Short mmCIF file of C-alpha atoms and ligand atoms in Angstrom, two decimals:
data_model
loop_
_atom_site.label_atom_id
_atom_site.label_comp_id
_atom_site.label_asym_id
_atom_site.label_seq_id
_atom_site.Cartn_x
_atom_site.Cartn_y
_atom_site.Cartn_z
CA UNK A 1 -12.66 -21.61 10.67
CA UNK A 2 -14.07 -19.77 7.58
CA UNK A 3 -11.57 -19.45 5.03
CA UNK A 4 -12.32 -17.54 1.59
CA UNK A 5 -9.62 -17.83 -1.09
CA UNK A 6 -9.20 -15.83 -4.01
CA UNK A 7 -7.99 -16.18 -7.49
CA UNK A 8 -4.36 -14.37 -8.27
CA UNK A 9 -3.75 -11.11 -9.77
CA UNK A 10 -4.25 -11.40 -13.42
CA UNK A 11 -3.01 -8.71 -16.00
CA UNK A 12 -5.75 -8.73 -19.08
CA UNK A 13 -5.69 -6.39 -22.05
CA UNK A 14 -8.63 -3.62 -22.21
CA UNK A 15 -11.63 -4.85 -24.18
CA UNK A 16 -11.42 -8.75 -22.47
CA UNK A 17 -13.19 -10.41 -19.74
CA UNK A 18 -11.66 -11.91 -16.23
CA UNK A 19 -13.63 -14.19 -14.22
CA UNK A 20 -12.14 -14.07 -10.39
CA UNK A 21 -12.73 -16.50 -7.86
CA UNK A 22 -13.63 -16.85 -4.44
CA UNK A 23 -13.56 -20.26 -2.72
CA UNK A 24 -15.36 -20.79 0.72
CA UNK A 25 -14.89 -22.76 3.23
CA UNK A 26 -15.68 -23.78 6.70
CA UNK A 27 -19.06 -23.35 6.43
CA UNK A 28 -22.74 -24.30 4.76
CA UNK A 29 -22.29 -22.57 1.82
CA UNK A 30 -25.82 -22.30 0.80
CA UNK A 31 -26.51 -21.12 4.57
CA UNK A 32 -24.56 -17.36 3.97
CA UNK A 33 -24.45 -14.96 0.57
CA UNK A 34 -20.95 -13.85 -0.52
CA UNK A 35 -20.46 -9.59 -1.40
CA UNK A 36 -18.00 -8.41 -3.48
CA UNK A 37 -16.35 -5.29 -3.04
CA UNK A 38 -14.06 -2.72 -5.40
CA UNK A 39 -11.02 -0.81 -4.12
CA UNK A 40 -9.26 1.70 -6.02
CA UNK A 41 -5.98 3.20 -4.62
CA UNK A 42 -11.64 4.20 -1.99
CA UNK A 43 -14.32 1.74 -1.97
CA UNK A 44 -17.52 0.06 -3.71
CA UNK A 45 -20.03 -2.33 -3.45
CA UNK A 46 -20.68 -4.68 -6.47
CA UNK A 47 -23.13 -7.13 -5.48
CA UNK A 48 -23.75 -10.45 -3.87
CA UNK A 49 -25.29 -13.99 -4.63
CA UNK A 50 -26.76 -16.08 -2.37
CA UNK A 51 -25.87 -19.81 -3.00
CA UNK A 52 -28.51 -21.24 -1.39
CA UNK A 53 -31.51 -19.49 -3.23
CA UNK A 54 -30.14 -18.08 -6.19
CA UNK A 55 -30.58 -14.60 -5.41
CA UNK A 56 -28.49 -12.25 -6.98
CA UNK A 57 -28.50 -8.74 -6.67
CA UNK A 58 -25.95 -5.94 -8.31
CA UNK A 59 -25.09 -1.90 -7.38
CA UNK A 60 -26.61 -0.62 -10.69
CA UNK A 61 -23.16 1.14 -11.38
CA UNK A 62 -22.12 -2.53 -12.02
CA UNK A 63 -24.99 -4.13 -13.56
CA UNK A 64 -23.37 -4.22 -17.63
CA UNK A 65 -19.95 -5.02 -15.83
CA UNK A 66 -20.00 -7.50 -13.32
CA UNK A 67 -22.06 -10.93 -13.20
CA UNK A 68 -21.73 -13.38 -10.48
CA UNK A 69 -22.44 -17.27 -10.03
CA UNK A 70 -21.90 -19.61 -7.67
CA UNK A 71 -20.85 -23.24 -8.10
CA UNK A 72 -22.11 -25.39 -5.18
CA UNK A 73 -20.27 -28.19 -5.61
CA UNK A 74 -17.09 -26.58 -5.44
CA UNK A 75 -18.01 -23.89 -2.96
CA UNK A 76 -16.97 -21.14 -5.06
CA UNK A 77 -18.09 -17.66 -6.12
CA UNK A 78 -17.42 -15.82 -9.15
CA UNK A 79 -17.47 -12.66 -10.47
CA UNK A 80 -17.09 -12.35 -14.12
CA UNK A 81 -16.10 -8.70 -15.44
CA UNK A 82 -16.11 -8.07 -19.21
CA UNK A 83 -15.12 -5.11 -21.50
CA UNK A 84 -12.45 -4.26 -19.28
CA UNK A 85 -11.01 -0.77 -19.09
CA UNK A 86 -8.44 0.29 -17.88
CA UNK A 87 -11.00 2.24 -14.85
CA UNK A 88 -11.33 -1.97 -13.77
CA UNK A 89 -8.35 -2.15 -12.45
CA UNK A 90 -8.60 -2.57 -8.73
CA UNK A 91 -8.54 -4.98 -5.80
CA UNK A 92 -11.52 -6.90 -5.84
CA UNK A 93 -12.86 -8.30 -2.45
CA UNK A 94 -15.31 -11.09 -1.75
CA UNK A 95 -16.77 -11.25 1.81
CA UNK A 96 -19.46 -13.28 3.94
CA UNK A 97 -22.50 -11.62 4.58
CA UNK A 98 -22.76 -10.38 7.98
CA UNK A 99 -19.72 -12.19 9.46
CA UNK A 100 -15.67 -10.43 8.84
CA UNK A 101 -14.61 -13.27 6.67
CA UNK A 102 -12.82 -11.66 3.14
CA UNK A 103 -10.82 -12.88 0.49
CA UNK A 104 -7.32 -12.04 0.54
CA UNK A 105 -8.35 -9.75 -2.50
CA UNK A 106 -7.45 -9.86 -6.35
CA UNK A 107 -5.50 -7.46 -8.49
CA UNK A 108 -6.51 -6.94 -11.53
CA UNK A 109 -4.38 -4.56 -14.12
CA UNK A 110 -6.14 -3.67 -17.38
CA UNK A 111 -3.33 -2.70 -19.52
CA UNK A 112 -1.75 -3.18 -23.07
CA UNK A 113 1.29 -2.97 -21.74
CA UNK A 114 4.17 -5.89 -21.89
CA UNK A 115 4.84 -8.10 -18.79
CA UNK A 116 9.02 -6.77 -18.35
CA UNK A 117 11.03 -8.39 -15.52
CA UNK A 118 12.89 -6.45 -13.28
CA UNK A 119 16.52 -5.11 -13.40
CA UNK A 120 18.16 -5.49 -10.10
CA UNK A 121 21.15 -2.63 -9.66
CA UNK A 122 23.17 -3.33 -6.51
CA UNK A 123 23.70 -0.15 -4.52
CA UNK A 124 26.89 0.18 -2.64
CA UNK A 125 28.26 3.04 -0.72
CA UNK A 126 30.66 5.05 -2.65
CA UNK A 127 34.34 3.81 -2.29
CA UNK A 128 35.03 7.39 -0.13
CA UNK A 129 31.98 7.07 2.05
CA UNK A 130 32.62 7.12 5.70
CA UNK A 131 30.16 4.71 11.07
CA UNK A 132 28.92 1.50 13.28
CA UNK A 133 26.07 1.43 10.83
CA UNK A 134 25.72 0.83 6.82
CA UNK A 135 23.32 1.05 4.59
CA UNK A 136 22.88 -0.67 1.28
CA UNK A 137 20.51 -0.69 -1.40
CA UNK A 138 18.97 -2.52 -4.48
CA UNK A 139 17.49 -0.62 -7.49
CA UNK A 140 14.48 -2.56 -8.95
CA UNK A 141 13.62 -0.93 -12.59
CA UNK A 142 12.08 -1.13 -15.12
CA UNK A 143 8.99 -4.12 -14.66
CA UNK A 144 5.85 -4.32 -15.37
CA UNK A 145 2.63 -5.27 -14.15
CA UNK A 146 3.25 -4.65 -9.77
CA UNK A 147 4.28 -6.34 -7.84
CA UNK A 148 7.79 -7.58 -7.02
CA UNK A 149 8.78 -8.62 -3.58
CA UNK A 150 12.27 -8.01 -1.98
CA UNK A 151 14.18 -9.36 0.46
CA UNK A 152 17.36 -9.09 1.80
CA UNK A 153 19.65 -12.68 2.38
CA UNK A 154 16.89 -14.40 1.84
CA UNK A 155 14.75 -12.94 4.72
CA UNK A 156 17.44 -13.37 7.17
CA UNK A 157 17.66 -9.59 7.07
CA UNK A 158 14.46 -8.53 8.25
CA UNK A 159 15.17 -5.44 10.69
CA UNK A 160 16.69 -2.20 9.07
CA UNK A 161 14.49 -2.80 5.85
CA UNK A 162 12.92 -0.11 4.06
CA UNK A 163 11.38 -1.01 0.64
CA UNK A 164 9.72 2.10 -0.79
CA UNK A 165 6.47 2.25 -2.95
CA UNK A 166 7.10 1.69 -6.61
CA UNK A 167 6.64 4.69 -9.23
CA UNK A 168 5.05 4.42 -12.93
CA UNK A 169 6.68 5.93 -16.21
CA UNK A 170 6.22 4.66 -19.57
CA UNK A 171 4.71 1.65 -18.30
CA UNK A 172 7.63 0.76 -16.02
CA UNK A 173 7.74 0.55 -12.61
CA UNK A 174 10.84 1.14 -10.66
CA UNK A 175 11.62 1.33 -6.43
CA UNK A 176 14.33 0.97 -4.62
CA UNK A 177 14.74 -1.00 -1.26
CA UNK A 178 17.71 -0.08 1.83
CA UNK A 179 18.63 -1.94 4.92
CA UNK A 180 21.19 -0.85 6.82
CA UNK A 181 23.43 -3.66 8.76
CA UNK A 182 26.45 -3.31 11.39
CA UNK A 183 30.08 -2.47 9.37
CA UNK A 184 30.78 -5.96 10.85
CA UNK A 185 29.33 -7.74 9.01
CA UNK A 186 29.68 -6.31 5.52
CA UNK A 187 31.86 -6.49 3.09
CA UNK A 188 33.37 -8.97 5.46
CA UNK A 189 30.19 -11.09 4.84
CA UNK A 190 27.47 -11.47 1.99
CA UNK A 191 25.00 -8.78 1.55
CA UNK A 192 22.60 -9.89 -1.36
CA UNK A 193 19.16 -8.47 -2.07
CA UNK A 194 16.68 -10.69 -3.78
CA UNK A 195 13.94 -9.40 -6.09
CA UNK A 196 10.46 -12.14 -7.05
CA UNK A 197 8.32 -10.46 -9.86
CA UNK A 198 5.78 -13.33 -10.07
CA UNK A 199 4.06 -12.10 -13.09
CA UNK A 200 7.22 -12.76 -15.29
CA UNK A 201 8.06 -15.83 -12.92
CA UNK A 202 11.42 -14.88 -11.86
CA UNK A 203 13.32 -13.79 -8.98
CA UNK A 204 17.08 -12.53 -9.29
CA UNK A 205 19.89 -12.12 -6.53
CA UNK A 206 21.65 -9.24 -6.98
CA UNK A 207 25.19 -8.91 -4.31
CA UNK A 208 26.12 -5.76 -3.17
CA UNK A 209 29.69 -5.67 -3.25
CA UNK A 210 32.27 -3.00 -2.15
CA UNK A 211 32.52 -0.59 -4.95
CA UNK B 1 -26.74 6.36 -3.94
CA UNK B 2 -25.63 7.65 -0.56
CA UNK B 3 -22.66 9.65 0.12
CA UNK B 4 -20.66 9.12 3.15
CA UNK B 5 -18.53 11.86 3.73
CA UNK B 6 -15.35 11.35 6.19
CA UNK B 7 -13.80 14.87 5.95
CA UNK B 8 -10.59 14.15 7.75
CA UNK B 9 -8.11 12.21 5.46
CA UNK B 10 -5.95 11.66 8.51
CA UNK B 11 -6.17 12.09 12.01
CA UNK B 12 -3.17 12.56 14.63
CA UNK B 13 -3.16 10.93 18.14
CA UNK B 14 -1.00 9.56 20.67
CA UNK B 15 -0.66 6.03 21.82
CA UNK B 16 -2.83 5.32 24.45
CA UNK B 17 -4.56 8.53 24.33
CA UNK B 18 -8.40 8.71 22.28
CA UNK B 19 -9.13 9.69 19.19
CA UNK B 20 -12.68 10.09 17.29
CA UNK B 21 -12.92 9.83 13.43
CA UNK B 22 -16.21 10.99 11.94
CA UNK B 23 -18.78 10.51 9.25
CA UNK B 24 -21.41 11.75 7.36
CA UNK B 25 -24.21 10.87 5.66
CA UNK B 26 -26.05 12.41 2.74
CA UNK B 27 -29.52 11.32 3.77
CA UNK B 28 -31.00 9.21 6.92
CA UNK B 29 -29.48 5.48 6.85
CA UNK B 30 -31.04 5.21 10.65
CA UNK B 31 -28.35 3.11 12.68
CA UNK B 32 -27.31 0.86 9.15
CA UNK B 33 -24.08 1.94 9.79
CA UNK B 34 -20.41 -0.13 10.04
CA UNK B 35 -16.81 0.90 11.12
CA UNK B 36 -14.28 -1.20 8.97
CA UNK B 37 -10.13 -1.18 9.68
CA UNK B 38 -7.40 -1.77 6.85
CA UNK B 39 -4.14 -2.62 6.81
CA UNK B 40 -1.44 -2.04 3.44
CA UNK B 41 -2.26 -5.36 1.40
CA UNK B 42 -4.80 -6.92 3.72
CA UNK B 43 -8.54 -6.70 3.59
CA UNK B 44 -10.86 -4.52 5.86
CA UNK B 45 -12.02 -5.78 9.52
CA UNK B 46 -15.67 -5.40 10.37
CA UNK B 47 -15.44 -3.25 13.83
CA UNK B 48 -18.62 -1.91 14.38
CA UNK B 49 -21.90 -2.64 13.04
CA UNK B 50 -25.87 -0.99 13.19
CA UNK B 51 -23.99 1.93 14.77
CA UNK B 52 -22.56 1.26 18.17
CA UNK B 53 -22.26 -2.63 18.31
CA UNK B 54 -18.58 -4.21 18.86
CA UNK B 55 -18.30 -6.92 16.72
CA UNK B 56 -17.19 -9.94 18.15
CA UNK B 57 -13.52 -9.78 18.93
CA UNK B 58 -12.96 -6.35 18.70
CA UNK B 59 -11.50 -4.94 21.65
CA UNK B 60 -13.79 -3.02 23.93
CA UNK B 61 -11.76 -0.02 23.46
CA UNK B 62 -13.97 0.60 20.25
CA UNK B 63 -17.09 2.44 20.69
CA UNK B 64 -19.14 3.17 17.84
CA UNK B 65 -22.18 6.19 18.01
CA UNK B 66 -24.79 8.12 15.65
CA UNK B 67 -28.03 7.86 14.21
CA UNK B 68 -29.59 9.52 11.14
CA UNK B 69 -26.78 11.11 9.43
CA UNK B 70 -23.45 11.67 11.97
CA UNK B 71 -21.91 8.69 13.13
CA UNK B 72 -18.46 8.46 15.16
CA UNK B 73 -16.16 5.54 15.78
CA UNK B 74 -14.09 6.39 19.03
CA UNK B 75 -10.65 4.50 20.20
CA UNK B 76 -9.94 4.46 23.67
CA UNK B 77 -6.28 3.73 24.69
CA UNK B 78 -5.05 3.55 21.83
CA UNK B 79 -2.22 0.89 19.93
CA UNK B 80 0.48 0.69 18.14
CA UNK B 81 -1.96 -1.80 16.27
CA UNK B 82 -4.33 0.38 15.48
CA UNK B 83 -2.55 2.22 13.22
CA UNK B 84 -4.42 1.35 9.97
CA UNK B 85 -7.19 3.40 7.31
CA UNK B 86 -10.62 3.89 9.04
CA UNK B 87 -13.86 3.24 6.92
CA UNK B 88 -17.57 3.90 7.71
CA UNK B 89 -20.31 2.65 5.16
CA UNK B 90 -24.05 2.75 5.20
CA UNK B 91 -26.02 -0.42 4.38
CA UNK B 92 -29.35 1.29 4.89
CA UNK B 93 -29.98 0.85 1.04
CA UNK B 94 -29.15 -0.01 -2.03
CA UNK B 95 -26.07 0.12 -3.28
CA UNK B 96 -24.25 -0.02 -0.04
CA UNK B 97 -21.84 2.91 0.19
CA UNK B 98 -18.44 3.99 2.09
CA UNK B 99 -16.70 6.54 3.04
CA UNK B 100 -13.62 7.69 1.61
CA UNK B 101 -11.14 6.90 4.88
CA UNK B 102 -9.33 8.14 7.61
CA UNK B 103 -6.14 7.27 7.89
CA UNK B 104 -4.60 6.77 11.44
CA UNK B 105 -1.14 8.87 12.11
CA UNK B 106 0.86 7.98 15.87
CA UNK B 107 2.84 10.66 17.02
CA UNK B 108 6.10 10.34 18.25
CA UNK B 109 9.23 12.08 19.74
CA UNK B 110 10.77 13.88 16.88
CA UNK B 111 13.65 11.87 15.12
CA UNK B 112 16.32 13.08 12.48
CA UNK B 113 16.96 11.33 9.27
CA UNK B 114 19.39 9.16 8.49
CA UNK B 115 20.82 9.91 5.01
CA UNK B 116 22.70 7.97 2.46
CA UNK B 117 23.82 8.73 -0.89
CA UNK B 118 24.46 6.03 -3.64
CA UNK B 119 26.21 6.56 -7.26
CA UNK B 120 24.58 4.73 -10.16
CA UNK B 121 25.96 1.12 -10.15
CA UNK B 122 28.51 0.42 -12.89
CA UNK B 123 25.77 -2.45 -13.84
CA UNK B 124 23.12 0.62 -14.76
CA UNK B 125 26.13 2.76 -16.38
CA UNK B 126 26.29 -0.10 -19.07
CA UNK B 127 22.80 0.65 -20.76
CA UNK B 128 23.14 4.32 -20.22
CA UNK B 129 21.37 5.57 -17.90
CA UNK B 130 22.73 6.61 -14.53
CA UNK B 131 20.60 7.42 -11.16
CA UNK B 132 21.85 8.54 -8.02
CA UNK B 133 19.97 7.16 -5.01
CA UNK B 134 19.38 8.81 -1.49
CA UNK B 135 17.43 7.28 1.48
CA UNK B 136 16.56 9.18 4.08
CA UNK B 137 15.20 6.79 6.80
CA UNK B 138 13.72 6.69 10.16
CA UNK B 139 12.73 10.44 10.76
CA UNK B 140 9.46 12.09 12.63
CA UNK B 141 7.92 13.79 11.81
CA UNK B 142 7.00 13.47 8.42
CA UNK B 143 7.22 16.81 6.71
CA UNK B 144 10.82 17.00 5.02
CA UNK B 145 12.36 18.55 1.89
CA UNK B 146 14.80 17.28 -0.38
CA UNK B 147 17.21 19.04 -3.09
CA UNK B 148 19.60 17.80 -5.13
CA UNK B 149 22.33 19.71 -5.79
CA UNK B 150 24.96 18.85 -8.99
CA UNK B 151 28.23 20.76 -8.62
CA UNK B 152 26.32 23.31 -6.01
CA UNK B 153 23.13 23.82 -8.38
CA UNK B 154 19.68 22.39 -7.90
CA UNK B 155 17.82 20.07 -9.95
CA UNK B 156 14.59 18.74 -9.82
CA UNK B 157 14.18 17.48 -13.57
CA UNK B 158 14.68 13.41 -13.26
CA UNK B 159 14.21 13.45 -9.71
CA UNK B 160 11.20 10.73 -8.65
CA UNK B 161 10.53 10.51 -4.70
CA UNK B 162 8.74 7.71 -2.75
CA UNK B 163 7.62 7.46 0.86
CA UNK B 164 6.81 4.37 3.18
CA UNK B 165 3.65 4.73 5.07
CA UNK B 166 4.45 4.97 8.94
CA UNK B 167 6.62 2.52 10.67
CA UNK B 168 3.79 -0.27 12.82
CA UNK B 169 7.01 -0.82 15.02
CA UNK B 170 8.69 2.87 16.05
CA UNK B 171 6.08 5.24 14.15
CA UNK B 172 8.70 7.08 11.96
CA UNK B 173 8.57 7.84 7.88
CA UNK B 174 11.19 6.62 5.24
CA UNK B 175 11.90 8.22 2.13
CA UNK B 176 13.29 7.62 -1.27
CA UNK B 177 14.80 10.22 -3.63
CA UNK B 178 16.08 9.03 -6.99
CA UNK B 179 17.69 11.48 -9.72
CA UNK B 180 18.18 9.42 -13.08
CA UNK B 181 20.48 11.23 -15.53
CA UNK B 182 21.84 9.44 -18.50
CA UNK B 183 25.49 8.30 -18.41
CA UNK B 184 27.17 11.31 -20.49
CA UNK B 185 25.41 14.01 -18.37
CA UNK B 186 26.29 11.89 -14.98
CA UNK B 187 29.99 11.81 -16.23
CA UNK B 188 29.77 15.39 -17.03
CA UNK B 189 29.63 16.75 -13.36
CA UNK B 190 31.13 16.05 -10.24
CA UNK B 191 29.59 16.37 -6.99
CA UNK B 192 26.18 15.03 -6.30
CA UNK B 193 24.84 15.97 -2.99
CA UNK B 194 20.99 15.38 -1.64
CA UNK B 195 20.20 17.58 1.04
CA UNK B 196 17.52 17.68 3.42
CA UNK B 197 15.62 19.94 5.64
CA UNK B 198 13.99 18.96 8.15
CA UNK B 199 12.57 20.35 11.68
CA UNK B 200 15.50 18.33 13.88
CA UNK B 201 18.22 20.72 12.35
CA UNK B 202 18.15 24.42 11.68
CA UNK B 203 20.91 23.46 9.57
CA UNK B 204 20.24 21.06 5.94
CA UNK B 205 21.29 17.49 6.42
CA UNK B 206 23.98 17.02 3.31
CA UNK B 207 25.45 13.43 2.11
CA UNK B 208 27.47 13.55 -1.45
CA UNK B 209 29.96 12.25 -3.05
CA UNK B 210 32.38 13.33 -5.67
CA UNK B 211 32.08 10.94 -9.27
CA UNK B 212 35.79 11.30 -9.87
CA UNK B 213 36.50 9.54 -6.58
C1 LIG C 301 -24.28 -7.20 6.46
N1 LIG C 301 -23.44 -6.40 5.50
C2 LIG C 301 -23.94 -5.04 5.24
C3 LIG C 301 -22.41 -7.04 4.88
O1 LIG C 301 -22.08 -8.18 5.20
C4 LIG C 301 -21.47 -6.23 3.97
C5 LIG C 301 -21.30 -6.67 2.65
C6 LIG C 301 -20.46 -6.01 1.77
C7 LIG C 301 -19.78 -4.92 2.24
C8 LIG C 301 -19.90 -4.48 3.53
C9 LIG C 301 -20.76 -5.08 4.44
N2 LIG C 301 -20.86 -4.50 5.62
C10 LIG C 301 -20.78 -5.13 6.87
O2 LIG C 301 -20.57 -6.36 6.87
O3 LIG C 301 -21.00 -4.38 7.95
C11 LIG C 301 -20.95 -5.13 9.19
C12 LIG C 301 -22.26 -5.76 9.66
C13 LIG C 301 -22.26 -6.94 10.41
C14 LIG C 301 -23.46 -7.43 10.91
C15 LIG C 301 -24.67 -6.81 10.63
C16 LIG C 301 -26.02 -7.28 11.12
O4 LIG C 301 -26.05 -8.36 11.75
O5 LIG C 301 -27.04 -6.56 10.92
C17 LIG C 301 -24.64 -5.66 9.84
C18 LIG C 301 -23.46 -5.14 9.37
#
């Protein structure tokens, strides 16, 4: 049971460095090299070190960008990335030679943009709408860096969800999110949608009540 | 560097039926050749390697062929799990390369949209700005037009759309159309409609609602 853990999405200002993570484990860690990999909403090869000899090698596109090291001790790769642009940003991948064991992957915004938390709109059908069926909504506007994660009652409402990929403008990100729940149950009962936007370490509840 | 060229972005197939996604390379990478799966959010899955060789736990309805330059991963039977971004790469030489994906599409009986309309919440109308939210959910197959219409004319300034990717469960597409206005111009007209067209009705597919109820 190889397990390879990343580091968490980090938002960094152009012109600094990041230094990402990968811990291994499950396994000799000198006995297997570790690859890291670039995706950009496709995807690229960086490198890889070998704990157990030393040997590093690096894709010559990222040879003045990238430099990896491995800690032994700790089991732990990392890939340092300095002068970032905003062309870095990505999900970064490390992976075991030969065998289909990845990191979860790291997202990395370059930006100079300011970390803004979420406003969470409630969206209610209109007071003249209307049949066994009804479908609510949450507004999510105006954060920045991505993510946020919504649910609905907490995850209790899990079927009838359809959270829609967010879209950029003026370094805001908005989406909306519907699920759509039997008349039975609402307004007669609470219908709530809850919004986490980790990099500004809240999460708000916004109710959708009868309008 | 070597350029692995996968020509179809997507490719259309039925559940257990078999499809064949292809790819090219620039120059001879012999049998160095692997056949990677990804899912939204999640990292790739090593199906194939040097070729035609299942790697361990892949189902055996994966076959993997080609040598040289043309390479083909093949799905037999396929699942609702498969639906997912296909990847080859070369690791013939240095700097390993991919190609740019194929993405997966499941087709399905057709399905009409179901469309909802939502005024701007009295919350947004506070800091002046006002959008007016439709969802049109569940449909198949994907291609689908939407117009807004304010008191029977069409707009398309302010309008931002959004799409899921397909549905792992029941294989149909969700959209998102939001108009944002600011507040005066939102309490200057009346009827908001968003209408869609879309193969399942000769006929557009209206919801609206009157502001000044
Ligand atoms: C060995 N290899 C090239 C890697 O680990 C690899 C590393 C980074 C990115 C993609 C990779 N590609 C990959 O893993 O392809 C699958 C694979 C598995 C086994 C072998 C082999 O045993 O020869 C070759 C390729």
């Amino acid at each position: 049971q190889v397990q390879l853990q990343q580091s968490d999405a980090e938002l960094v200002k152009p012109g600094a460095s990041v230094k990402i993570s990968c811990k291994a484990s499950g396994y000799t860690f000198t006995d297997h090299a570790i690859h890291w990999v670039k995706q950009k909403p496709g995807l690229e090869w960086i490198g890889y070190i070998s704990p157990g000899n030393g040997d590093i090698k690096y894709n010559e596109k990222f040879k003045g960008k990238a430099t990896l090291t491995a800690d032994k001790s700790s089991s732990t790769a990392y890939m340092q990335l300095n002068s970032l642009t905003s062309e870095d940003s990505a999900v970064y991948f490390c992976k075991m030679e030969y065998l289909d064991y990845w990191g979860q992957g790291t997202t990395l915004t370059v930006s100079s943009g300011g970390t803004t938390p979420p406003s969470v709109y409630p969206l209610a059908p209109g007071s003249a709408a209307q049949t066994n069926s009804v479908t609510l909504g949450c507004l999510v506007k105006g954060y920045f860096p991505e993510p946020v994660t919504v649910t609905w009652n907490s995850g209790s409402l899990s079927s009838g969800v359809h959270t829609f990929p967010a879209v950029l403008q003026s370094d805001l990100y908005t989406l909306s999110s519907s699920v759509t729940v039997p008349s039975s149950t609402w307004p007669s009962q609470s219908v709530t949608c809850n919004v986490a936007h980790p990099a500004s370490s809240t999460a708000v509840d916004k109710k959708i009540a009868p309008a | 560097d070597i350029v692995m060229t996968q020509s179809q972005k997507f490719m259309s197939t039925s559940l257990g039926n078999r499809v064949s996604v292809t790819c090219k390379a620039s120059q001879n990478v012999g049998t160095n050749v692997a056949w990677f799966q990804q899912k939204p959010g999640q990292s790739p899955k090593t199906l194939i390697y040097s070729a035609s060789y299942r790697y361990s736990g892949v189902p055996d309805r994966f076959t993997g062929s080609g040598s040289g330059t043309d390479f083909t991963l093949t799905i037999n039977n396929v699942q609702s799990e498969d639906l997912a971004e296909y990847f080859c790469q070369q690791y013939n030489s240095y700097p390993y390369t991919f190609g740019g994906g194929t993405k997966l599409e499941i087709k399905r009986a057709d399905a009409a949209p179901t469309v909802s309309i939502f005024p701007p919440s009295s919350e947004q109308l506070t800091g002046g700005g006002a959008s007016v939210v439709c969802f049109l959910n569940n449909f198949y197959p994907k291609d689908i037009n939407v117009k807004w219409k304010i008191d029977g004319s069409e707009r398309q300034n302010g309008v931002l759309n959004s799409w899921t990717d397909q549905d792992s469960k029941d294989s149909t597409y969700s959209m998102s159309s939001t108009l944002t206005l600011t507040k005066d111009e939102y309490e200057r007209h009346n009827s908001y409609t968003c209408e869609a067209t879309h193969k399942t009705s000769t006929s557009p597919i209206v919801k609206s609602f009157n502001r000044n109820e």
